[PDB]
């Protein structure tokens, strides 16, 4: 509650999502975002078998939180489709 977990994972995913620096190739959508992929493949543990509440178990990480410090660091309109795209990918994994 004094050091703000949240606050540095925000600036963890945010840091993720800098380390992904997506471009686009022939003006179609082209996903850089690798690192934060591979860091939701990791989190999870097949924590089904394991009893732990993984159905259900990524409402951590926020979208608003996280896209406000990306228009912060000026990212939006560069990697908000793909941004969607994983929130697509990770709300129904």
Do not use: H
């Amino acid at each position: 509650s004094e050091v703000d977990v949240e606050e540095l994972k925000l600036e963890i995913l945010c840091k993720a999502i800098k380390r992904d620096e997506w471009s686009a190739t022939d003006g179609k959508d082209d996903p850089i975002e690798a690192t934060k992929d591979s860091i939701f493949v990791k989190v999870l543990q097949n924590l089904l078998n394991k009893g732990i509440e993984l159905k259900g178990y990524l409402p951590k990480a926020e979208t608003l939180l996280q896209s406000e410090e990306l228009n912060s660091l000026k990212t939006n309109s560069y990697f908000e489709f793909s941004l969607k795209a994983n929130y697509e990918c990770y709300m129904k994994m």
